[PDB]
Amino acid sequence: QDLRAFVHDSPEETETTQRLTKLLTNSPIPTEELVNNLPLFLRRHQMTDLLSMDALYRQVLDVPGVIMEFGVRFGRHLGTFAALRGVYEPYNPLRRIVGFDTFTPGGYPAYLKEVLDAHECSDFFGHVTQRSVLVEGDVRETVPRYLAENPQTVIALAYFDLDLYEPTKAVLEAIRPYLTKGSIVAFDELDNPKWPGENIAMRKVLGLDHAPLRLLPGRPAPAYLRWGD
Amino acid sequence: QDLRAFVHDSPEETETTQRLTKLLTNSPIPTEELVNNLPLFLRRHQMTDLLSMDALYRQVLDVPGVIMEFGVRFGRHLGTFAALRGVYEPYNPLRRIVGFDTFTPGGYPAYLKEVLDAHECSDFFGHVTQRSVLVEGDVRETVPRYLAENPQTVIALAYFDLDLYEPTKAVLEAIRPYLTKGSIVAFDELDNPKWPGENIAMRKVLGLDHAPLRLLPGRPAPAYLRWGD
Amino acid sequence: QDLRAFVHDSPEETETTQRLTKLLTNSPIPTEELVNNLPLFLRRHQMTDLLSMDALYRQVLDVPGVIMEFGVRFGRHLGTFAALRGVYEPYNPLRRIVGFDTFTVPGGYPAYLKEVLDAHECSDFFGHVTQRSVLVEGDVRETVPRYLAENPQTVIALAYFDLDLYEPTKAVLEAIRPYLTKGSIVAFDELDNPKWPGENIAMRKVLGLDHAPLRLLPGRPAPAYLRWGD
Amino acid sequence: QDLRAFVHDSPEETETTQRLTKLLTNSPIPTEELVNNLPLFLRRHQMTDLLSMDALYRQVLDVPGVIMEFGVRFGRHLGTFAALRGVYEPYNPLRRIVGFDTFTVPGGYPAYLKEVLDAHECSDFFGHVTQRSVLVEGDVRETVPRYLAENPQTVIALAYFDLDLYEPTKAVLEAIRPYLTKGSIVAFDELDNPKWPGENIAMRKVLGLDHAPLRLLPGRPAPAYLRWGD
Amino acid sequence: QDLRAFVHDSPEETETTQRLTKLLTNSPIPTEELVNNLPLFLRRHQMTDLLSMDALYRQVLDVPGVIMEFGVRFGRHLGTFAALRGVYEPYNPLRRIVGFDTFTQGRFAVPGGYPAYLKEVLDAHECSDFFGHVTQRSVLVEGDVRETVPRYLAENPQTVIALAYFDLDLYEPTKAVLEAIRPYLTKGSIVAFDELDNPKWPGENIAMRKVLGLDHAPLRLLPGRPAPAYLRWGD
Amino acid sequence: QDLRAFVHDSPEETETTQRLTKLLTNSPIPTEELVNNLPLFLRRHQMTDLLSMDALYRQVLDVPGVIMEFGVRFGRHLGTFAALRGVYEPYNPLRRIVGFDTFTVPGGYPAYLKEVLDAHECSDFFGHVTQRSVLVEGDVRETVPRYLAENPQTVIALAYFDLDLYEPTKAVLEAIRPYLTKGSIVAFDELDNPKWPGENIAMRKVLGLDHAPLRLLPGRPAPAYLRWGD
Amino acid sequence: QDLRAFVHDSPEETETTQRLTKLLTNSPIPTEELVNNLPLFLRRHQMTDLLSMDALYRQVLDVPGVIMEFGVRFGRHLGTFAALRGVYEPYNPLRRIVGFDTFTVPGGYPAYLKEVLDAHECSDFFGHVTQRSVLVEGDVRETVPRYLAENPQTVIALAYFDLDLYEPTKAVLEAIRPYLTKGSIVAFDELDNPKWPGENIAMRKVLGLDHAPLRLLPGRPAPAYLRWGD
């Protein structure tokens, strides 16, 4: 197997990343102004991800329910969604953001919860708790349990970043009764040769023509569908 | 004069900013992954600014010419534009980004140029130089000089953050022959009680009904117009 | 359980509400002019409810039939619908407004609410036609089927659910279904609210959440509403 | 039963109607010019009905077939359709207008109504083609199936139901179905009216209220109409 | 059989083709500049084919997956797709281009056969792609599609097919490939045919009617052009 | 001056160009089939120019008149226009293509280019009409006014500027203006290019950059084009 | 001068025309059915002209006034307009068709052409109103101003120019201008044709080519037409 046939960073993309890291860590900007200048260090590749999450969020502003991410890494998308919920939905305390991951750095979920709490403390409904929830464990156990604990659930946006067949299949099967027509289901690596399990699960549970799978033009991921279309 | 009648941060907005600063500077994320997770620390207020710059940029993707910012602070908008030019215009080496400021930390323009060079080194046209330019000095001298040196100039997007009457007036007068119908002219504080000089200049040079001034809904700034409309 | 995870008023929202109450009841406006100035006392949160009911009504102006609310509280929505019917439908005497509740509020509250609705109706263009507002007291599991049996002409243009609980919500969904047309609106006051999961459980039991497209009016957590047949 | 809960004329609507009757029948307008000034005497309520029939007709200008009215009263809609066919379709001799009624009106009323329709048709571009207006006298349960058997070329573009009762509405809905296309309009004069529930009972029996989207013309309680196949 | 009832070149079309060939190979343009002036030699008929492929590509820019061509001739469409992928998708390394064919100077046989030359062509486009460091973004598969297409899909379970272009002529291969690709299409994928309604090659139509039916989805032309005939899956 | 601030080819773009040149000229494709496979050798950068010329042409299909190019290099755009005219306009013998250049390329290059254009034209539906392609050799400051004086029927649908310099660009803009209609396209190959500022200086002198809306095809630095009168 | 640079028929177009002439004049179709089968003999080129006139007429169906043709040849367009007026406007007796020509055609040709137009009009819905088709014989420089003086009610909805020459085109453009409204169509048969530059010279003299947007119907070299006021 030729590893070069998998997506990987060019030398220039690596150079850009390393330079921006160094300029962030050794910045003459006053430390208390760094979080007012983060776009200085946000290169094309990561800007694109932010714009894509914005695009998905904007498609469910007229859909009830919660946002769920299955596979969260360090929380990039969860921070994005917390900020965007401020931009678009000051008066919606029911738009819960739920992140599922095994999380295996230690004690990282506690840090990430501190980050999400910091966004939430200036929300208009910051007095309502449990608007951001991190669920630690294997999704084959935690997603059914979360849903059993939350029979009020409607899912407006479901973001899949699980990579593997068995967990992707189990979660697709579990979330289906909580979707409405217009709910968005999005995949981080549906058609990526490195991680074929997501496609295999999609074909097993639903079929690739169950609904129209779409790209945001110019961007290889995410692939996303509108339920019922 | 009651200073509370000017826009200022709420205690919660300050708390969010301070918390996110601390979580950025004391982060368990591996240092070389911070620039892959900047949305964790990008609160609503600053996300909104990014989305607004994206919106303005998207309105000039079918307009020739350069992007100019008059008054640049630490360069937040210049970094944003450098990344967005990657997202939208890999094959446009003529979309120069020009920032004008007195810049008065010392040697800061050199740092900011290092930042912009770091984005540019993975651009498709990264071999073409002078696609990002910082012009140091008073805009009443530097903007006419830049234009005299660049008679090829068309201005697609002009962003005003000068605050004061005399420099805003001088730059509006200087850039006018380089605009086309469809060029965007945007103001950071047109209708803000703290900085009335921008409005006074706009009314002197053009008139507030010269073209339709618009907001992005929900956002008090920028105010922007499409030339010729 | 943490009660802070349920929606509740901020201290600032409570303060606004208490202040506006005091200014309404201690007003230098002449008594006979208060009802010409009620927006002085209509705060954001309640203004939003009004605009939402107007948006739902405007979606059924080309749909025949009646408006039903299942769970009416003090009658806020029924008064809204009575005024909007005047705004949009002076010539439609068949747009009946039917409110169902146990009314368990002061005793004799239904008679007061009926007097309020009659006061709107006496200046309607069709104010001489009776029974254009109906309050039905009792358990919706009996009263909604009984109302429909008594009214076989029924078509339902707008059905608004504020019943909270599984059994009543399930029984009413099942009963109203033969009286909906494609384009009828079915709306829910607390479909996705952790405090009252029975509404969702009943919707998933009877129809399923993807039976039709559930929507929000952007920026507002409720109502959630669907257009039948879409 | 409270008869004021059925739609009925206000005193003012009665006054307008009686005054306009007097002014029509005692007019200083020369006799031969009265039929050039009928809008003087066409009040809101009746103008609304005319505008509604025009709206329904305009929706079937690109649909083949005939117009049928089941229950015709004195013929108001048939005259309306005869004139509108002149406005919109001078070159379409296949747009037959067929009215079905028992005519149980003065005696010999159908012959009068036929004289009226012939008077419109004698200035039609295709006035030399006969049987473009047909009055079919009898119980629709017998006459509509017989008409369709005699006319196997039939396509129905617009079907207007004003039969009031369950058994005839059901029988005619069942008989006309094979002659509709997608886009044909089916319209009801009293689908949701408390006075005449049989029309609704029949619609629910034969098709279901959500078989197709039932619509109003906004602001008007009737007709309720659907586009076949939507 | 009257062979004039099959589509063939007019004398004037032949004349144009022969003249432009002469002017291409005997040109005062410096040889190193010819690839900057190819439109001088690209006549209407061939320009039309290029515009048609651009129209099909533009319809799948918001559809995930790969581009496949079944029956590739000298590779005209594969080169077009490689250039167009540059135009529209610099940042999409997952848009693989896969050409299937049996592949069965001027006088010396090419070592490795025509596929070795055509791979050289596609490599030449890819070395200036923004994602030119990711390999296997263009793939040629030699052999009988009845075997090679199922094998390729078995080997590539991540596949989604955004654009499937059929130029196989015959019933049995067209039927087999239609059957194999179906689980990999989404609603909005484009399936296109080079000779669906062509008297010379009825097997393509026979296979379409057998597997799907001509009214499975709406078959369309680009107006004014007899081919391709194409459908949007699920419409 | 830093020559790196002017647009120039990356090493990878040079490599692609050289490789495709070698594969074109050492091809196992039969000689008489090369012109059926030129897209094998048409790289991104040149494909983009073709799609841009097609987009401009498609915007003048409902505009009368001719196509003019001022500065033609080896004739790339003229060949493109000749093929596109076949694609879109088999029945329009009045869509003349006029190329103006000094032709200072090998000597006798205009005769070769004319032979190329004639080869396209001999299979056009109107190939029997002559002078549908015209090459005008000389200084545009004399030749464009002379062409227009000789051709008072002229309407200009598309004017494409690739003259680089101030004086020729200014003279041609001034000359063509009476032959444009609202909707004519005026396009520039290097309006905002630091290497050739005279084009911009001339546009600002004659018309001004806001005389009409200058546009890009998104993602492409050139051409910049305006629709006259907008 | 190279006469092959003017538009002219190909050998194949001549062959089609001559063959269809023979088949029209030696047809086994019964004589009285020939005028029911004329499309058998209506080739592409002439069909295109008919479709163009239909397109221009359809653009003025919501514009008051008359149709004028300046230069009428044997009357092809006048017959086309007479038929299209039947298709689209049975109830508009004010849509006069006026043809201006010197008729310098066989002798007495205008009387023949009038018989043809009367033959269309005798089956028009308003066939009893005379002077709905008018042929005005003479030099347009005299006849058009005289016609307008005799007809101060004139509004011009569509003006079709086929005069070829500068002086008559200029004079008629100047005379008709006060009778156009915004939306009136002005159309030219040879505005950009090298054979007849005088039409363009006149347009540039009186109005300028950018006075309004000149358009083609795509794929057709003529007519070129503008919507007044755009």
Residue numbers in the entry:
A (entry chain C), B (entry chain C): 7 to 110, 133 to 257
C (entry chain B), D (entry chain D), F (entry chain B), G (entry chain D): 7 to 110, 132 to 257
E (entry chain E): 7 to 110, 127 to 257
Show sentences the authors wrote:
CalS11 uses S-adenosylmethionine (AdoMet, SAM) as the methyl donor. Structural flexibility and dynamics are generally key for protein function. The sequence identity of NovP and CalS11 is 20%.
